[PDB]
Design a protein around this motif. Structure first.
Motif, PDB file in Angstrom:
ATOM      1  N   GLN A  78       2.721   1.613  -3.338  1.00 50.01           N
ATOM      2  CA  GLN A  78       1.801   1.990  -4.403  1.00 50.01           C
ATOM      3  C   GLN A  78       1.363   3.442  -4.265  1.00 50.01           C
ATOM      4  O   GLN A  78       1.284   4.164  -5.263  1.00 50.01           O
ATOM      5  CB  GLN A  78       0.588   1.060  -4.403  1.00 50.01           C
ATOM      6  CG  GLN A  78       0.884  -0.344  -4.915  1.00 50.01           C
ATOM      7  CD  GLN A  78       1.262  -0.363  -6.384  1.00 50.01           C
ATOM      8  OE1 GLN A  78       0.618   0.284  -7.210  1.00 50.01           O
ATOM      9  NE2 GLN A  78       2.312  -1.106  -6.717  1.00 50.01           N
ATOM     10  N   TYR A  79       1.081   3.888  -3.038  1.00 46.63           N
ATOM     11  CA  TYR A  79       0.709   5.282  -2.823  1.00 46.63           C
ATOM     12  C   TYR A  79       1.855   6.218  -3.189  1.00 46.63           C
ATOM     13  O   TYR A  79       1.639   7.259  -3.823  1.00 46.63           O
ATOM     14  CB  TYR A  79       0.293   5.485  -1.366  1.00 46.63           C
ATOM     15  CG  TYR A  79      -0.103   6.904  -1.026  1.00 46.63           C
ATOM     16  CD1 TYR A  79      -1.374   7.380  -1.319  1.00 46.63           C
ATOM     17  CD2 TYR A  79       0.791   7.765  -0.405  1.00 46.63           C
ATOM     18  CE1 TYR A  79      -1.741   8.676  -1.007  1.00 46.63           C
ATOM     19  CE2 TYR A  79       0.434   9.060  -0.089  1.00 46.63           C
ATOM     20  CZ  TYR A  79      -0.833   9.512  -0.392  1.00 46.63           C
ATOM     21  OH  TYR A  79      -1.191  10.802  -0.079  1.00 46.63           O
ATOM     22  N   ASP A  80       3.082   5.866  -2.798  1.00 47.89           N
ATOM     23  CA  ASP A  80       4.227   6.701  -3.148  1.00 47.89           C
ATOM     24  C   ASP A  80       4.401   6.799  -4.657  1.00 47.89           C
ATOM     25  O   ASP A  80       4.601   7.899  -5.186  1.00 47.89           O
ATOM     26  CB  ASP A  80       5.498   6.148  -2.503  1.00 47.89           C
ATOM     27  CG  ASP A  80       5.499   6.297  -0.995  1.00 47.89           C
ATOM     28  OD1 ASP A  80       4.561   6.924  -0.458  1.00 47.89           O
ATOM     29  OD2 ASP A  80       6.435   5.786  -0.345  1.00 47.89           O
ATOM     30  N   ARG A 128       2.095   6.383  -7.022  1.00 36.47           N
ATOM     31  CA  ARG A 128       0.955   7.092  -7.463  1.00 36.47           C
ATOM     32  C   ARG A 128       1.152   8.580  -7.352  1.00 36.47           C
ATOM     33  O   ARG A 128       0.941   9.355  -8.291  1.00 36.47           O
ATOM     34  CB  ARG A 128      -0.303   6.583  -6.900  1.00 36.47           C
ATOM     35  CG  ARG A 128      -0.791   5.287  -7.260  1.00 36.47           C
ATOM     36  CD  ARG A 128      -1.495   5.121  -8.496  1.00 36.47           C
ATOM     37  NE  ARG A 128      -2.063   3.904  -8.813  1.00 36.47           N
ATOM     38  CZ  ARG A 128      -3.175   3.379  -8.411  1.00 36.47           C
ATOM     39  NH1 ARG A 128      -3.907   4.040  -7.687  1.00 36.47           N
ATOM     40  NH2 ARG A 128      -3.515   2.241  -8.734  1.00 36.47           N
ATOM     41  N   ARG A 129       1.568   9.009  -6.161  1.00 34.04           N
ATOM     42  CA  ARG A 129       1.812  10.431  -5.943  1.00 34.04           C
ATOM     43  C   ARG A 129       3.020  10.937  -6.719  1.00 34.04           C
ATOM     44  O   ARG A 129       3.068  12.127  -7.046  1.00 34.04           O
ATOM     45  CB  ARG A 129       2.000  10.715  -4.451  1.00 34.04           C
ATOM     46  CG  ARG A 129       0.706  10.694  -3.646  1.00 34.04           C
ATOM     47  CD  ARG A 129      -0.222  11.845  -4.020  1.00 34.04           C
ATOM     48  NE  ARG A 129       0.410  13.149  -3.853  1.00 34.04           N
ATOM     49  CZ  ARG A 129       0.564  13.768  -2.690  1.00 34.04           C
ATOM     50  NH1 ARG A 129       0.139  13.229  -1.558  1.00 34.04           N
ATOM     51  NH2 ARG A 129       1.156  14.958  -2.661  1.00 34.04           N
ATOM     52  N   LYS A 130       3.987  10.071  -7.017  1.00 36.57           N
ATOM     53  CA  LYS A 130       5.128  10.457  -7.836  1.00 36.57           C
ATOM     54  C   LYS A 130       4.786  10.581  -9.313  1.00 36.57           C
ATOM     55  O   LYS A 130       5.386  11.414 -10.002  1.00 36.57           O
ATOM     56  CB  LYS A 130       6.262   9.441  -7.669  1.00 36.57           C
ATOM     57  CG  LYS A 130       7.583   9.878  -8.280  1.00 36.57           C
ATOM     58  CD  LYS A 130       8.689   8.877  -7.986  1.00 36.57           C
ATOM     59  CE  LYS A 130       9.989   9.262  -8.671  1.00 36.57           C
ATOM     60  NZ  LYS A 130      11.066   8.261  -8.436  1.00 36.57           N
ATOM     61  N   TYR A 154      -2.064  15.862  -8.365  1.00 34.44           N
ATOM     62  CA  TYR A 154      -2.644  16.003  -7.028  1.00 34.44           C
ATOM     63  C   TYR A 154      -3.142  17.430  -6.853  1.00 34.44           C
ATOM     64  O   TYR A 154      -2.450  18.283  -6.283  1.00 34.44           O
ATOM     65  CB  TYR A 154      -1.622  15.640  -5.948  1.00 34.44           C
ATOM     66  CG  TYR A 154      -2.230  15.431  -4.580  1.00 34.44           C
ATOM     67  CD1 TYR A 154      -2.730  14.192  -4.203  1.00 34.44           C
ATOM     68  CD2 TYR A 154      -2.305  16.473  -3.666  1.00 34.44           C
ATOM     69  CE1 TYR A 154      -3.286  13.995  -2.953  1.00 34.44           C
ATOM     70  CE2 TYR A 154      -2.861  16.287  -2.414  1.00 34.44           C
ATOM     71  CZ  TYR A 154      -3.349  15.047  -2.064  1.00 34.44           C
ATOM     72  OH  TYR A 154      -3.902  14.856  -0.818  1.00 34.44           O
ATOM     73  N   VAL A 202       0.799  -1.166   0.000  1.00 34.03           N
ATOM     74  CA  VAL A 202       0.000   0.000   0.000  1.00 34.03           C
ATOM     75  C   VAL A 202       0.850   1.242   0.000  1.00 34.03           C
ATOM     76  O   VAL A 202       0.639   2.195  -0.757  1.00 34.03           O
ATOM     77  CB  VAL A 202      -1.132   0.034   0.993  1.00 34.03           C
ATOM     78  CG1 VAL A 202      -1.712   1.319   1.128  1.00 34.03           C
ATOM     79  CG2 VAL A 202      -2.093  -0.985   0.798  1.00 34.03           C
ATOM     80  N   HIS A 203       1.833   1.264   0.903  1.00 34.40           N
ATOM     81  CA  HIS A 203       2.698   2.433   1.014  1.00 34.40           C
ATOM     82  C   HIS A 203       3.475   2.682  -0.273  1.00 34.40           C
ATOM     83  O   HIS A 203       3.523   3.820  -0.758  1.00 34.40           O
ATOM     84  CB  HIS A 203       3.664   2.261   2.188  1.00 34.40           C
ATOM     85  CG  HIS A 203       2.989   1.925   3.481  1.00 34.40           C
ATOM     86  ND1 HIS A 203       2.963   0.646   3.995  1.00 34.40           N
ATOM     87  CD2 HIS A 203       2.316   2.698   4.365  1.00 34.40           C
ATOM     88  CE1 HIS A 203       2.303   0.647   5.139  1.00 34.40           C
ATOM     89  NE2 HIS A 203       1.899   1.880   5.386  1.00 34.40           N
TER      90      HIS A 203
END
Lengths: 214, 148, 70, 443, 35, 197, 107, 60
Positions: free
Chosen positions: F159-161, F163-165, F169, F156-157
């Motif tokens: 994938q979120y990183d 995604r945000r990269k 946003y 999760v962590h």
RNA sequence: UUUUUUUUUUUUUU
RNA sequence: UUUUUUUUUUUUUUUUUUUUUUUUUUUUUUUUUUUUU
RNA sequence: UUUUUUUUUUUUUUUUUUUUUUUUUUUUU
RNA sequence: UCCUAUUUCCUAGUACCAUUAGUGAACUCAUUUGGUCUGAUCCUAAGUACGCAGUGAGCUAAAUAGAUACAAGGAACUUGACAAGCAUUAC
RNA sequence: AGGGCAUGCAAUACCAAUCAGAUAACAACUGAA
């Protein structure tokens, strides 16, 4: 009412028992008296006529509330009152008194049971109760926290009573003993207001009012 | 407001509590504390404990707790706990301030003999706004737009 | 006012959608009463729920009759 | 108007301080009350002059004067002695009422003068039949306070009380009993009769207020029978609420002594009753302030010079100990005095004997030091040290305390006079040593 | 009535004005008992 | 029982504030849960879980059992009948006493029980079961340690990183305060005044 | 003692309904006829007896009032009131005699 | 418009009204008026021994 | 804004 | 500097006021005139 | 813990209220 | 015999009247759920080692009162820059 | 009218210059009812 003279030969005072909806102690009886009598006079009445043992006499003034005639098919809209102004007296007798005389009972309303509920309820709009310190709690004429281990009391208490407080601790409402080294609460077992010597040294923190000066 | 009409110091005050100038010596003073002869008058400890806290300097190792008899505070007592010594809303940089009603940070600095204050909304984040204000003050000082 | 003398009848004229329910406080009060009777050992809820001519000695109910087939 | 900002601050802080101060005063004030009671059903209507010519005075006059002096606390030797001298002359024309008043006054004043008691006793003895409750009570009450035992007369007093039981007051009856028990003048039969009448009196014409006065440890264990003991003990529990520390102490003492001396009677009590006493001991009972006596201090100095560790004053459950050794806690000393013995004699009092026996039973190595023996030593320290050392090597006192040799008023007086100067010379010598006297001024 | 105003007025019962009229429930012509 | 039936005094002898308030309410429901004859409870540290040994009532043999009844089938107990009305009438006891008559059970079945923080029954174990469980303890520690290695972190962590990269946003505005007659200009300036000598 | 306040009355929890009903019964009030023949001491004692009965009755009265019901046998109160009035009537006449005599002598 | 029982009683009470230069002839519920109300009526066929009529003129 | 046995009365003061 | 509190009562000092006055409640302690220091 | 009572401070009377009923030969017990 | 003198002092059962001890403007007024929310203090608080409080159902019409996001131009609008906007965006 | 009949309506007016209050030492001190 008429004032009481010095020498009373034909007293007209009428004494009666009042059934109160609140809880009363064992050694306490509620009476209805005039509004023109004193503590001393009340005491003497019972002491001489009835000859009952008396310790304390408390007095209260009872005034009925206002009412309005609003109900019915033909209301009048007029004001009135129910009952009469009187003195609610409370006598602390030596002997015990049954509850079936002083306290009311009713099966239709199960909530109306002052004798069963005792002082657990307030019987009024008192959300928070008040209870001053007890005699035993107070310093003067108060139970000692260290007198249990004395030699003299044990002598009296011979195969009749155990003075050790460790034999009367509730198990369902007590926590295990923590380690001093480890953080722990003060109220868990310390039933006093002084830090035990067993506890290690504790540090002090001072608030910084002007940290920008650094 | 920082008006003249205020104490110069910000330290806790412990003024002397002088006794009446006509009373005799206390009763606890009549005690023989010698190893051989021992004499403990009535209320000796009671009187001496109170008497010791007269000077104002000899408050004892544990001053905040040697007089609070109320259980209300004792109930909350804890041992072996680390605590901070700085309010969250207090920046070390000079000229920074926070406003409760406006809910925003402000920076005070002097330029050309004139007072100027800038707005910093903290709705997006307390730490973010605080750091932005500190960076603005540092940029002011670095670029040289603050009088000295 | 119990005497019905103030101007508290003015607002009532107009229609309303709903009113507050002090469930939180009422629950607490009821609980305290229940506790005060429980310490003595008498069930109040049971008596406030049992059918008119119903007899249920102790902690018993419908469930009791299940296993008690005989 | 308006005030300066500077002044405003100071005035407000001062004001605040006032509030704080007021809050801080009523702390210890617990037992106080705005309302109070004053006894007034004893003063005479007639007016008198204390400062008047004693010769012009009469029995009535003198009687009044005596009581008024006592009430006003006008302690004057020159005044009191004239009263005594005129009373001696008018001894043959005193009514029972007047005599009682005189006695009450003397007693209240604590005017230690045996010469008058000894002279007025015989006339009281003859007028006993015409005596009343008040007179009878006052006689004994005065006598007790002044510590002048008279078993010849006190007994007669009691007998007259019993004869006039139908006319006597509960309070006076109780006080008579108490006095009798303290003086130790009641044979078994008298004691029994007194007890029997007392029980009925207490159970018929006594209240909470009046009952408390019947509680006495010295009396309980020496006058009262088992049937009255049990009833007393049981009613105390019920009547405990309406009590004072003075009665509490007595009650506790009673309990202790009963337990220690009469196991049977103790066991005869009920569980509930027992519990009361059990729990009582655990409570903190207030006590009056106490300090060593000059005799005490002299003895302590001699003891310390001998090289023994001990204490000055301390409580042990229910009994006070004069001296307590630290190396051997078991050991204890007691410093007696003139008051410890009856007037003109060396006989110990009932309370002293009871306290001696209770501790001896409980296992306390008890020693006693008299004052008439001590005084003889003078202001010499080596003699006192040797005196003490000779006592230490000897065994302790027996369980049962005994009386000393005979004495006399003359001897008593002599001793007192002698001691008077010793207590002053020792103080002077003590006080002089504290002065360094080093500083010398040129001038 | 205020304190200052009330401090300079007498009582109505201090005068004879109360016995100079015949107002009553019956009317305006009152006759005293036993007249 | 967790409470003393008919206790002395005119007030409760236990706290009624905080968590205790809840606990009293919770326990009042069940006035007889804890057997009168039971061993003290022993909670564990991590999760509130207590152990205690007690004696359970007997039961009728399954042979003689009718069958399951209702949504919660349960075997019947083994107890004797109460005195009949005819005998109770002749008995010298009072009406109150007579009305309050109950059956008599047999408690001869010793068992160990495990409860939660709330003293809620969860499981029952016997002597044979307890003895058997002790012989497999060493064999279970090795299995637990071997299975511990199969756990992996949460993706999760990461994938979120990522995604945000590699995604947009957007951010919206906040606290749009209005203004009166006079508008703002980003910064404000103070006033200057002179003293009166 | 204190027990007298409720002993034998309806309020008494140590007796049955039949005992209370039997106790409830009462006779006629003391008339002036009978009251005139008695001495000061007898009338003085009867005054206290009637006061005790009134005190006992009042309790029941109030008890009934509580539940909004009529007290059983309400005539007792009336009876006691009549006796109490008649005693004082007697006494007052006794006094008036002497007053008259005195007046006569002064004239 | 505040509520002050002290003010009310100090300015509008029974003892304060008597000091007012008003028409006291008007009937007052909560006041001491000076209007006469004609008393108890004549006697019919009751006992003559129990008819009350006077008190302050007859008190002795 | 007066604190514990009640009144009369004089000076100073944290 | 715009120039700020004191009487009832408490303490101290000075005295020839007075049952309009402190339990006939209680404890402790070597103790007191004139023809015993 | 207040109210009551002295002072501030006032018949600047809070109807049915008070330490307040004719004011000490009080039978001291 | 080196203490600033080794000067006995817990606490008398107690007249008459006021009182619902906690949150909350609880006061005039009145469109009055008394009690939640709307503002500073009172507790060395990871919001106080589970505290107070929360009122029918359905539905994409349009208009109106508000919130968030608008290509290029950026005062061409209006008597007037009224209103709206800027003051948060690599971490 | 045989018996009894709490309390409040501010009461020395069955008499006596006026002016507050349980009705004021002279004077200050005054006035259409």
């Amino acid at each position: 009412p008429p004032k009481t003279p010095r020498n009373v030969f034909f007293p007209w005072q009428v004494f009666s028992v009042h059934r109160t909806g609140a809880f009363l102690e064992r050694r306490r009886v509620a009476l209805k008296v005039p509004v023109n009598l004193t503590k001393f006079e009340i005491q003497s009445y019972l002491e001489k006529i009835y000859g009952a043992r008396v310790l304390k006499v408390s007095t209260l003034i009872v005034v009925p509330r206002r009412r309005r005639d609003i109900f019915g098919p033909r209301p009048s809209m007029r004001y009135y009152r129910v009952g009469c102004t009187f003195k609610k007296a409370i006598v602390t007798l030596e002997d015990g008194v049954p509850d079936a005389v002083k306290m009311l009972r009713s099966s239709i309303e199960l909530a109306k049971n002052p004798d069963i509920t005792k002082h657990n309820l307030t019987y009024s709009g008192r959300v928070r109760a008040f209870k001053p310190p007890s005699a035993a709690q107070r310093w003067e004429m108060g139970e000692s926290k260290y007198a249990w281990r004395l030699p003299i009391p044990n002598l009296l208490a011979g195969d009749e009573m155990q003075l050790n407080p460790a034999l009367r601790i509730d198990e369902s409402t007590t926590q295990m003993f923590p380690d001093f080294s480890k953080p722990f609460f003060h109220n868990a077992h310390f039933n006093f207001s002084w830090k035990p010597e067993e506890v290690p040294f504790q540090q002090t923190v001072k608030l910084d009012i002007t940290p920008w000066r650094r | 407001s920082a008006n003249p009409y205020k104490p110069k110091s910000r330290e806790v005050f412990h003024p002397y509590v002088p006794a009446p100038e006509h009373l005799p010596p206390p009763a606890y003073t009549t005690a023989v504390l010698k190893p051989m002869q021992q004499f403990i008058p009535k209320d000796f400890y009671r009187d001496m404990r109170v008497d010791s806290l007269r000077d104002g300097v000899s408050l004892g190792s544990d001053f905040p707790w040697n007089v609070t008899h109320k259980y209300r505070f004792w109930r909350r007592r804890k041992y072996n706990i680390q605590l901070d010594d700085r309010f969250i809303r207090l920046s070390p940089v000079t000229g920074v301030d926070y406003y409760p009603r406006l809910n925003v940070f402000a920076v005070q600095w002097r330029e050309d003999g004139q007072h100027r204050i800038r707005w910093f909304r903290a709705a997006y984040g307390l730490t973010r706004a605080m750091r932005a204000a500190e960076n603005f003050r540092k940029t002011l000082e670095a670029t040289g737009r603050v009088d000295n | 006012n119990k005497v019905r003398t103030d101007k508290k009848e003015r607002k009532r004229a107009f229609p309303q959608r709903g009113f507050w329910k002090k469930q939180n406080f009422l629950q607490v009060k009821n609980n305290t009463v229940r506790l005060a009777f429980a310490v003595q050992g008498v069930d109040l809820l049971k008596l406030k729920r049992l059918r008119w001519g119903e007899v249920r000695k102790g902690n018993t109910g419908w469930w009791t009759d299940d296993y008690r087939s005989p | 108007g308006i005030l300066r900002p500077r002044e405003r601050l100071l005035l407000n802080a001062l004001k605040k301080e006032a509030d704080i101060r007021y809050r801080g005063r009523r702390m210890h004030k617990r037992f106080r009350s705005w309302a109070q009671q004053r006894v007034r059903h004893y003063w005479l209507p007639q007016k008198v002059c204390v400062t008047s010519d004693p010769q012009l005075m009469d029995g009535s006059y003198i009687a009044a004067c005596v009581q008024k002096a006592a009430t006003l606390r006008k302690h004057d030797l020159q005044l009191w002695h004239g009263f005594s001298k005129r009373i001696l002359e008018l001894a043959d024309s005193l009514t029972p009422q007047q005599m009682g008043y005189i006695f009450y006054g003397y007693g209240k004043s604590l005017f230690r003068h045996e010469e008058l008691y000894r002279g007025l006793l015989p006339f009281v003895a003859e007028a006993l039949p015409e005596f009343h409750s008040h007179a009878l009570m006052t006689v004994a009450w005065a006598l007790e306070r002044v510590r002048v035992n008279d078993r010849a007369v006190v007994a007669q007093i009691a007998e007259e009380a019993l004869a006039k039981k139908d006319l006597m007051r509960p309070a006076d009856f109780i006080k008579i009993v108490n006095c009798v028990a303290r003086m130790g003048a009641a044979p078994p039969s008298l004691a029994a009769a007194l007890s029997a009448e007392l029980m009925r009196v207490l159970d018929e014409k006594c209240n909470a207020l009046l009952f408390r006065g019947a509680v006495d440890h010295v009396a309980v264990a020496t006058l009262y029978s088992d049937p009255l003991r049990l009833y007393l003990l049981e009613r105390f529990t019920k009547t405990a609420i309406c009590c004072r520390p003075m009665h509490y102490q007595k009650a506790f003492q009673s309990a202790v002594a009963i337990r220690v001396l009469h196991p049977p009677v103790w066991q005869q009590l009920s569980k509930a009753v027992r519990n009361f006493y059990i729990r009582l001991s655990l409570r903190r009972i207030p006590q009056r302030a106490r300090r060593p006596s000059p005799l005490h201090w002299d003895v302590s100095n001699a003891l310390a010079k001998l090289g023994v560790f001990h204490r000055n004053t301390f409580q042990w459950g229910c009994f006070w100990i004069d001296i307590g050794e630290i190396d051997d806690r078991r050991q204890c000393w007691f410093v007696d005095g003139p008051s410890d013995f009856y007037s003109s004699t060396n006989e110990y009092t009932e309370a002293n004997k009871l306290q001696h026996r209770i501790l001896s039973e409980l296992g306390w190595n008890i020693r006693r030091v008299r004052w008439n023996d001590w005084v003889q030593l003078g202001t010499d320290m080596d003699a006192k040290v040797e005196y003490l050392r000779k006592l230490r090597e000897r065994p302790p006192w027996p369980a049962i305390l005994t009386d000393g040799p005979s004495s006399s008023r003359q001897e008593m007086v002599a001793n007192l006079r002698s001691a008077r100067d010793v207590q002053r010379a020792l103080k002077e010598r003590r006080e002089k040593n504290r002065q360094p006297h080093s500083l010398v001024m040129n001038l | 009535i205020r304190p200052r105003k009330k401090g300079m007025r007498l009582d109505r019962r201090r005068s004879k004005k109360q016995y100079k009229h015949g107002r009553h429930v019956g009317g305006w012509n009152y006759r005293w008992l036993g007249s | 029982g967790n409470f003393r039936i008919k206790p002395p005094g005119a007030r409760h002898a236990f706290p009624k504030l905080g968590t205790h308030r809840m606990v009293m309410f919770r326990r009042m429901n069940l006035l007889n849960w804890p057997p009168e004859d039971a061993s003290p409870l022993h909670p564990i540290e991590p999760w509130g879980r207590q152990f205690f040994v007690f004696n359970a009532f007997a039961t009728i043999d399954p042979a003689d059992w009718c069958g399951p009844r209702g949504p919660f089938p349960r075997l019947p107990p083994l107890a004797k009948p109460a005195p009949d009305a005819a005998t109770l009438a002749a008995s010298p006891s009072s009406l109150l006493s007579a009305l309050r008559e109950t059956e008599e059970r047999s408690a001869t079945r010793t068992v160990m029980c495990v409860t939660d923080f709330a003293q809620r029954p969860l499981m029952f174990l016997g002597k044979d079961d307890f003895r058997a469980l002790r012989e497999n303890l060493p064999r279970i520690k090795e299995e637990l340690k071997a299975f511990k290695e199969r756990i992996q972190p949460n993706p999760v962590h990461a994938q979120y990183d990522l995604r945000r990269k590699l995604l947009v946003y957007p951010r919206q505005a906040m606290q749009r305060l209005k203004t009166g007659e006079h508008g703002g200009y980003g910064t404000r300036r103070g006033t200057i005044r002179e003293r009166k000598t | 003692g204190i027990d007298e306040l409720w002993k034998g009355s309806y309020l008494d929890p140590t007796i049955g309904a039949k005992q209370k009903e039997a106790n409830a019964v009462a006779g006629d009030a003391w008339p002036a006829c009978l009251l005139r023949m008695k001495s000061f001491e007898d009338l003085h004692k009867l005054w206290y007896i009637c006061l005790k009965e009134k005190n006992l009755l009042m309790g029941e009265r109030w008890a009934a009032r509580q539940h909004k019901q009529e007290m059983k046998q309400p005539e007792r109160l009336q009876k006691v009131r009549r006796t109490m009035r008649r005693i004082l009537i007697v006494l007052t006449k006794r006094e008036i005699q002497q007053q008259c005599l005195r007046a006569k002598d002064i004239l | 418009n505040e509520s002050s029982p002290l003010h009310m009683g100090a300015g509008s009470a029974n003892w304060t009204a008597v000091a007012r230069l008003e028409d006291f002839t008007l009937r007052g519920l909560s006041h001491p008026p000076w209007i006469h109300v004609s008393s108890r009526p004549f006697y019919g066929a009751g006992g003559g021994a129990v008819l009350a009529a006077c008190m302050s003129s007859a008190v002795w």
